[PDB]
Design a protein around this nucleic acid. Structure first.
Lengths: 10, 10
DNA sequence: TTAGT
DNA sequence: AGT
DNA sequence: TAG
DNA sequence: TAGT
């Protein structure tokens, strides 16, 4: 996710 | 930092 | 068996 | 990545 | 088992 | 020097 906590996705 | 981006500190 | 601060 |  |  |  995020970042943080990419995306998703990417 | 954070987490993310601990604390600081801890 | 992921991809991707 | 984020004294 | 970081999400 | 630290601690998702």
């Amino acid at each position: 996710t995020x970042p943080g906590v990419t995306x998703p996705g990417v």
